[PDB]
Design a binder for this molecule. Structure first.
Ligand SMILES: [Pt+2]
Ligand SMILES: [Pt+2]
Lengths: 67, 67
């Protein structure tokens, strides 16, 4: 399943932070689009799990849907 | 007790993310200095709680000491 999220990232360090939390989660294939504030994730993890992992950064997060 | 941390923040959004995870922890009084990449926290929470809360954000954190 391929999930897409809005993540409020403003600088490269913001993007690195998201990468670090996703790395620590494991079991994910992710793609981070900094200028458009999007994080695309392919994973067997539930959307709830991905959402909670992203919210751990303290950044504003929302769901852009599947596929 | 005032704990002091180095936190690799490189934009205002980075600073706000740190404030959010601290707010959610609760029981903290803090000051975030962006240009100097320093967070100062007054709290009864253990430094282990504080550190883990900061590290949860995906940013590079290290501990500077007390005051
Ligand atoms: Pt995508
Ligand atoms: Pt940032």
């Amino acid at each position: 399943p391929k999930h897409e999220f809005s993540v409020d990232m403003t600088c490269g360090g913001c993007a690195e932070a998201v990468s670090r939390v996703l790395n620590k989660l494991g079991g994910v294939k992710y793609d981070i689009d900094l200028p458009n504030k999007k994080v695309c994730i392919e994973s067997e993890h539930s959307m709830d799990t991905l959402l909670a992992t992203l919210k751990k950064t303290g950044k504003t997060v929302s769901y852009l849907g599947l596929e």
